């Protein structure tokens, strides 16, 4: 059967657990599609390797609220790319849909949290959904079957190192 | 509204100019959770969607089928993985040892090479825990590997020594389980 993963918290690797677990799906010929939130306006070195594996990328693309600083216009972008996740999760030729950095979308009222309770509740049953974000509401938790909260024991970017691409993105 | 985001902005962008420095930095992923292993290949799979050299070495044996292996190695990402012998028993700790410390060699050359941009350390933890290799020299490694590489160390119980010397650490709690639900390991996700 297919089960609901979710990570969360605020330490690093959330989204490159979601990425190594569809690098897991895809080198045993598994077909995983892929929703991002919010990110899109820099380079995506996991977008880079897997999408020439066939993994549909459909991202938000407008970046961070704080520097957008239009609720309406994130809120529209979010609904739209909200229509291909609502599209995979209702895909039975996939095995796997990664919904990255959805939990802000729910947490900031873009996106009606009852939608995404059905549209996971109606997916094709062999279908695992992996979910990533900080500060994910408790109803998708209780649905998680699988949930790791990731602990910021420590991170580089507080002893002054900078993001880089390769590590940070 | 923008003046709140505004101040969000201000203080992303502080602690953004007080962060200045590029070099390669020690991550290690532990913790009972799920989630060690697949963020390291998601990191390694990020490295190499950038044109990064990545190598890796797996301190246990490839008998499953490997989804991330099968992915990353024709990419050129080097794998070298544990003996298939190797049984984890006090009555054959001597060759266990021995087969700890044949891979580690190439652990080691990984950790010496400057055309490497990240190497993956995947499962070391329980090495040291349990005296298969020792501490010191995975110290020492580290600490005279090239200035611009990144090193990714998994595995449940790593030893305190090799946390402080990291510069990220994120414990994975695991929060739920789909195996206490009685949920079987599936290939793709489990393995
Ligand atoms: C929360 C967070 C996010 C959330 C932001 C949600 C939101 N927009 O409201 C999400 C996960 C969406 C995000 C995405 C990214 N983020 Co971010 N994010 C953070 C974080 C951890 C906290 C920010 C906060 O609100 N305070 C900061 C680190 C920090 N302590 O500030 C990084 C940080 C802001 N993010 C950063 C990065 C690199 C990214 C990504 C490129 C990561 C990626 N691999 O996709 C994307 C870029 C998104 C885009 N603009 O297209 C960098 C930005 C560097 C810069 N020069 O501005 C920071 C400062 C982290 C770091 N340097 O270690 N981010
Ligand atoms: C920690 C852990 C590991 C550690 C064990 C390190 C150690 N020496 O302590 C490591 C990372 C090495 C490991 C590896 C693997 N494991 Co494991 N492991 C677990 C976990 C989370 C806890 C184990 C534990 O605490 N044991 C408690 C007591 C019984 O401990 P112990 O028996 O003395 O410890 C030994 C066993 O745990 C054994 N073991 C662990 N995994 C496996 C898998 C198989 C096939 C066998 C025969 C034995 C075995 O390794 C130790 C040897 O000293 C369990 C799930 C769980 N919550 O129980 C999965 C679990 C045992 N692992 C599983 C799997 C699938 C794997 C891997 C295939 C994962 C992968 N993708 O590579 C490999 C298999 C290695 C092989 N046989 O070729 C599955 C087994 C499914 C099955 N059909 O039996 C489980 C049940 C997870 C799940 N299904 O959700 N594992
Ligand atoms: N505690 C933190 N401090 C500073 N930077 C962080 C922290 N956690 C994550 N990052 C980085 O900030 C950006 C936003 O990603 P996010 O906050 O979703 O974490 P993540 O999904 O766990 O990180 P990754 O994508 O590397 O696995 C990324 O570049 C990420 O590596
Ligand atoms: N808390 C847990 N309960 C049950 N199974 C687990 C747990 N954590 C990991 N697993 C699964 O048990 C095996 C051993 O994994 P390990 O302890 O190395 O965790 P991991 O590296 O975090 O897992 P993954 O490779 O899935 O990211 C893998 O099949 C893994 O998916
Ligand atoms: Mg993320
Ligand atoms: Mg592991």
Redesign the interface.
Known sequence: ?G?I?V?T?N??????????????????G?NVGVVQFIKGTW????????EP?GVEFQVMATG????T?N?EADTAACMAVWQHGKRMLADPLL??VVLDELTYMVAYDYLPLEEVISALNARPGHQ?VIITGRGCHRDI?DL??????????????D????A????D?
């Not at 880089?164 to 590590?167: D, H, S």
């Open positions: 059967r089960i993963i990570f918290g330490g690093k690797g959330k989204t490159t657990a979601a990425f190594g677990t569809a690098a897991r799906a895809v080198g045993h598994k380079p995506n070195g996991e977008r880079n390797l897997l594996h961070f609220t704080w520097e600083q609720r095995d796997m695992t938790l998680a079957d699988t949930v790791s909260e990731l602990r910021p024991v420590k991170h580089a970017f002893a002054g190192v900078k880089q691409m390769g590590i993105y």
